[PDB]
Amino acid sequence: IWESPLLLAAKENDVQALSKLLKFEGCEVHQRGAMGETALHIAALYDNLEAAMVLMEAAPELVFEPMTSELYEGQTALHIAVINQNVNLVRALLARGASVSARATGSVFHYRPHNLIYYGEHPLSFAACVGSEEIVRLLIEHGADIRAQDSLGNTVLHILILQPNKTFACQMYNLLLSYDGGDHLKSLELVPNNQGLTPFKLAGVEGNIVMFQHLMQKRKHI
């Protein structure tokens, strides 16, 4: 960042500096930092909407670029914007065609004792985990697949079982299922992960008392 004027301008939300650099074809607009991050990743991380807009306007291809480091492999500006709950930035990226299918597969995202979070891989899974109903709805409206599975076979339903904040997780679980509806084959609730556990069974295995009860009474009603 500090050695690159474009990355620095993005960090500083310095719209004038960005615009003057971008008009050159002097700055390589696709230059990357040490984590394989672009100026647009940097704008998103720092919650700099104006810099992100200037960059997307000037170089819309940046919307699709993943971080390339092993730690952050696959992370897109949309994933970052979702984590920051920047609704305006999420809408902007989506309006420009940002992929709702992009998978964040870098080591910091892995389901591991050492990692602080596990939010799965997909933007929708991130959105459900940070608790943004508005962002969840925006993503689904742009074609996000509620049935998408991560590398462990976990759907968003499983991933919600693994989260600490059980009260919103339950509301989010139901929000997500309201888009599943009366489909002519298996409820998403019946899809197992690679361990062979459905969300209900996973809740039991993990000692998620809130979700185990919720889901148990659910099936009895169904």
Tab-separated table of C-alpha atoms in Angstrom:
chain	number	residue	atom	x	y	z
A	1	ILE	CA	0.000	0.000	0.000
A	2	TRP	CA	2.431	2.691	1.245
A	3	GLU	CA	4.718	2.287	-1.824
A	4	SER	CA	1.804	2.232	-4.330
A	5	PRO	CA	-0.031	5.537	-4.876
A	6	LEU	CA	-3.176	3.759	-6.184
A	7	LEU	CA	-3.495	1.344	-3.243
A	8	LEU	CA	-2.780	4.219	-0.866
A	9	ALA	CA	-5.353	6.470	-2.481
A	10	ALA	CA	-7.929	3.676	-2.166
A	11	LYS	CA	-7.089	3.258	1.561
A	12	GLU	CA	-7.357	7.041	2.108
A	13	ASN	CA	-10.641	7.377	0.158
A	14	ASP	CA	-8.799	10.029	-1.922
A	15	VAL	CA	-11.048	10.380	-4.946
A	16	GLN	CA	-9.006	13.146	-6.623
A	17	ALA	CA	-5.740	11.191	-6.402
A	18	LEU	CA	-7.429	8.011	-7.714
A	19	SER	CA	-8.970	9.835	-10.647
A	20	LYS	CA	-5.643	11.399	-11.640
A	21	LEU	CA	-3.801	8.052	-11.378
A	22	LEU	CA	-6.492	6.179	-13.302
A	23	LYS	CA	-6.537	8.649	-16.206
A	24	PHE	CA	-2.865	7.789	-16.955
A	25	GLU	CA	-2.624	4.134	-17.968
A	26	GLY	CA	0.512	4.810	-15.870
A	27	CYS	CA	-0.662	3.037	-12.750
A	28	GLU	CA	-1.335	-0.599	-13.547
A	29	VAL	CA	-4.918	-0.681	-12.308
A	30	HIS	CA	-4.565	-4.416	-11.618
A	31	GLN	CA	-1.454	-4.052	-9.397
A	32	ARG	CA	-1.669	-6.038	-6.160
A	33	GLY	CA	-0.494	-5.821	-2.550
A	34	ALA	CA	1.246	-8.567	-0.569
A	35	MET	CA	-2.042	-10.468	0.054
A	36	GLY	CA	-2.874	-10.393	-3.664
A	37	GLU	CA	-5.336	-7.576	-3.072
A	38	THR	CA	-6.377	-4.931	-5.660
A	39	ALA	CA	-7.158	-1.279	-5.025
A	40	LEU	CA	-10.838	-2.273	-4.996
A	41	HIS	CA	-10.285	-4.885	-2.269
A	42	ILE	CA	-8.536	-2.164	-0.307
A	43	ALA	CA	-11.436	0.317	-0.793
A	44	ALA	CA	-13.930	-2.337	0.306
A	45	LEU	CA	-11.892	-3.339	3.382
A	46	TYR	CA	-11.649	0.261	4.571
A	47	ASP	CA	-15.365	0.827	3.857
A	48	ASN	CA	-14.514	3.541	1.333
A	49	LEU	CA	-17.564	3.707	-0.875
A	50	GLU	CA	-16.447	6.691	-2.956
A	51	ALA	CA	-13.062	5.199	-3.811
A	52	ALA	CA	-14.725	1.904	-4.655
A	53	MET	CA	-17.111	3.693	-7.042
A	54	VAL	CA	-14.302	5.531	-8.792
A	55	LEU	CA	-12.393	2.271	-9.199
A	56	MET	CA	-15.426	0.288	-10.445
A	57	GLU	CA	-16.308	3.012	-12.917
A	58	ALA	CA	-12.772	3.283	-14.248
A	59	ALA	CA	-11.898	-0.413	-14.165
A	60	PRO	CA	-15.048	-2.547	-13.823
A	61	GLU	CA	-12.993	-5.736	-14.323
A	62	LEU	CA	-11.754	-5.229	-10.708
A	63	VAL	CA	-15.217	-6.302	-9.530
A	64	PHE	CA	-14.461	-9.941	-10.418
A	65	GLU	CA	-10.903	-10.263	-9.105
A	66	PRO	CA	-10.199	-12.535	-6.149
A	67	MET	CA	-7.479	-12.152	-3.554
A	68	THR	CA	-4.742	-14.585	-4.534
A	69	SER	CA	-2.791	-15.159	-1.306
A	70	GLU	CA	-3.198	-18.536	0.379
A	71	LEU	CA	-4.762	-16.821	3.418
A	72	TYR	CA	-7.472	-14.965	1.461
A	73	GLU	CA	-7.720	-17.026	-1.704
A	74	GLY	CA	-10.939	-16.345	-3.580
A	75	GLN	CA	-12.145	-13.407	-1.490
A	76	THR	CA	-13.882	-10.810	-3.687
A	77	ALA	CA	-14.794	-7.152	-2.987
A	78	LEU	CA	-18.383	-8.427	-2.546
A	79	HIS	CA	-17.380	-10.831	0.247
A	80	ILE	CA	-15.595	-7.882	1.996
A	81	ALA	CA	-18.540	-5.546	1.569
A	82	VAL	CA	-20.835	-8.225	3.016
A	83	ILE	CA	-18.596	-8.678	6.108
A	84	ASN	CA	-18.623	-4.890	6.661
A	85	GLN	CA	-22.404	-4.838	6.140
A	86	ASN	CA	-21.989	-2.008	3.617
A	87	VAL	CA	-25.363	-2.215	1.944
A	88	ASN	CA	-24.629	0.575	-0.539
A	89	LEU	CA	-21.356	-1.092	-1.609
A	90	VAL	CA	-23.008	-4.523	-1.899
A	91	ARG	CA	-25.735	-3.025	-4.127
A	92	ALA	CA	-23.155	-1.203	-6.272
A	93	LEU	CA	-21.065	-4.341	-6.836
A	94	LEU	CA	-24.095	-6.476	-7.544
A	95	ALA	CA	-25.445	-3.902	-10.028
A	96	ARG	CA	-22.161	-4.218	-11.913
A	97	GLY	CA	-22.430	-8.002	-12.163
A	98	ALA	CA	-20.302	-9.124	-9.116
A	99	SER	CA	-20.540	-12.908	-8.806
A	100	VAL	CA	-22.760	-14.264	-6.086
A	101	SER	CA	-21.170	-17.689	-6.688
A	102	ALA	CA	-17.583	-16.694	-5.883
A	103	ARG	CA	-16.001	-18.911	-3.261
A	104	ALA	CA	-13.628	-17.683	-0.545
A	105	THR	CA	-11.463	-20.738	-0.050
A	106	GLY	CA	-8.373	-19.215	1.591
A	107	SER	CA	-7.043	-20.580	4.862
A	108	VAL	CA	-8.531	-17.827	7.015
A	109	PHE	CA	-11.978	-18.990	5.886
A	110	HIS	CA	-11.513	-22.655	6.782
A	111	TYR	CA	-13.526	-24.456	9.464
A	112	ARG	CA	-10.641	-24.839	11.946
A	113	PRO	CA	-10.088	-24.609	15.715
A	114	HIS	CA	-7.452	-21.865	15.153
A	115	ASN	CA	-9.725	-19.671	12.963
A	116	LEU	CA	-12.031	-17.135	14.643
A	117	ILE	CA	-14.915	-17.404	12.199
A	118	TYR	CA	-16.395	-19.950	9.940
A	119	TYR	CA	-18.796	-18.378	7.495
A	120	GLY	CA	-18.528	-20.838	4.665
A	121	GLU	CA	-17.332	-19.717	1.236
A	122	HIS	CA	-20.161	-17.903	-0.555
A	123	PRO	CA	-21.369	-14.316	-0.204
A	124	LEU	CA	-24.854	-15.529	0.928
A	125	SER	CA	-23.267	-17.638	3.703
A	126	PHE	CA	-21.242	-14.573	4.812
A	127	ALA	CA	-24.410	-12.422	4.810
A	128	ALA	CA	-26.398	-14.959	6.882
A	129	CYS	CA	-23.552	-15.147	9.422
A	130	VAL	CA	-23.144	-11.425	9.956
A	131	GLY	CA	-26.987	-11.203	10.335
A	132	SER	CA	-27.916	-8.774	7.501
A	133	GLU	CA	-31.463	-9.562	6.252
A	134	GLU	CA	-31.237	-6.745	3.690
A	135	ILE	CA	-27.986	-8.064	2.224
A	136	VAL	CA	-29.337	-11.641	2.230
A	137	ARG	CA	-32.354	-10.442	0.231
A	138	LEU	CA	-30.217	-8.407	-2.210
A	139	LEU	CA	-28.005	-11.457	-2.859
A	140	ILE	CA	-30.975	-13.803	-3.468
A	141	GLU	CA	-32.520	-11.205	-5.826
A	142	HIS	CA	-29.249	-11.367	-7.800
A	143	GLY	CA	-29.428	-15.143	-8.108
A	144	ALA	CA	-27.544	-16.447	-5.036
A	145	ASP	CA	-28.205	-20.178	-4.638
A	146	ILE	CA	-29.493	-20.936	-1.142
A	147	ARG	CA	-28.566	-24.596	-1.730
A	148	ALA	CA	-24.860	-23.888	-2.394
A	149	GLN	CA	-22.475	-26.148	-0.500
A	150	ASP	CA	-18.940	-25.433	0.663
A	151	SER	CA	-15.953	-27.758	0.541
A	152	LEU	CA	-17.324	-29.622	3.610
A	153	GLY	CA	-20.754	-30.123	2.034
A	154	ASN	CA	-22.196	-27.514	4.377
A	155	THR	CA	-25.144	-25.474	3.201
A	156	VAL	CA	-25.913	-22.090	4.731
A	157	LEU	CA	-28.259	-23.961	7.098
A	158	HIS	CA	-25.353	-26.005	8.529
A	159	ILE	CA	-23.161	-22.918	8.736
A	160	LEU	CA	-25.796	-21.106	10.785
A	161	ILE	CA	-25.824	-24.029	13.278
A	162	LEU	CA	-22.120	-23.384	13.855
A	163	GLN	CA	-22.545	-19.668	14.781
A	164	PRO	CA	-22.417	-18.184	18.359
A	165	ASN	CA	-25.426	-15.809	18.136
A	166	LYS	CA	-28.305	-18.319	18.269
A	167	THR	CA	-31.195	-15.800	18.419
A	168	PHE	CA	-30.621	-14.079	15.043
A	169	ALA	CA	-29.339	-17.395	13.585
A	170	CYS	CA	-32.784	-18.861	14.083
A	171	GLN	CA	-34.533	-15.935	12.364
A	172	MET	CA	-32.030	-16.116	9.536
A	173	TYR	CA	-32.538	-19.885	9.169
A	174	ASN	CA	-36.262	-19.280	8.689
A	175	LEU	CA	-35.670	-16.320	6.370
A	176	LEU	CA	-33.543	-18.529	4.174
A	177	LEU	CA	-36.144	-21.319	4.166
A	178	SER	CA	-38.886	-18.870	3.145
A	179	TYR	CA	-37.122	-18.784	-0.248
A	180	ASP	CA	-36.959	-22.604	-0.380
A	181	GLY	CA	-40.768	-22.830	-0.276
A	182	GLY	CA	-42.797	-25.567	-1.971
A	183	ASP	CA	-40.158	-26.968	-4.352
A	184	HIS	CA	-40.943	-30.296	-6.056
A	185	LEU	CA	-37.970	-32.072	-4.428
A	186	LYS	CA	-36.027	-32.333	-1.240
A	187	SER	CA	-36.207	-29.604	1.318
A	188	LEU	CA	-32.814	-27.973	1.826
A	189	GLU	CA	-33.214	-29.161	5.443
A	190	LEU	CA	-32.728	-32.738	4.229
A	191	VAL	CA	-29.424	-32.084	2.471
A	192	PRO	CA	-26.512	-33.574	4.446
A	193	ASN	CA	-22.944	-32.389	4.650
A	194	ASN	CA	-19.846	-34.537	3.950
A	195	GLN	CA	-20.072	-35.913	7.502
A	196	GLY	CA	-23.600	-37.190	6.608
A	197	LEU	CA	-25.341	-34.777	9.001
A	198	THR	CA	-28.400	-32.692	8.190
A	199	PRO	CA	-28.669	-29.340	9.942
A	200	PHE	CA	-31.016	-30.843	12.614
A	201	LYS	CA	-28.562	-33.638	13.383
A	202	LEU	CA	-25.633	-31.234	13.315
A	203	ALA	CA	-27.380	-29.051	15.863
A	204	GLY	CA	-27.645	-32.077	18.109
A	205	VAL	CA	-24.058	-33.128	17.613
A	206	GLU	CA	-22.738	-29.601	18.306
A	207	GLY	CA	-24.906	-28.997	21.366
A	208	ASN	CA	-26.711	-26.049	19.756
A	209	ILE	CA	-29.683	-26.231	22.144
A	210	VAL	CA	-31.657	-23.403	20.466
A	211	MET	CA	-31.434	-24.793	16.972
A	212	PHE	CA	-31.840	-28.469	18.045
A	213	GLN	CA	-35.148	-27.683	19.728
A	214	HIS	CA	-36.321	-25.392	16.903
A	215	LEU	CA	-35.613	-27.992	14.274
A	216	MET	CA	-36.944	-30.952	16.293
A	217	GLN	CA	-40.364	-29.310	16.794
A	218	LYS	CA	-40.263	-28.257	13.129
A	219	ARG	CA	-40.161	-31.840	11.829
A	220	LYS	CA	-42.985	-32.905	14.194
A	221	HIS	CA	-45.125	-30.088	12.741
A	222	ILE	CA	-44.019	-31.221	9.251
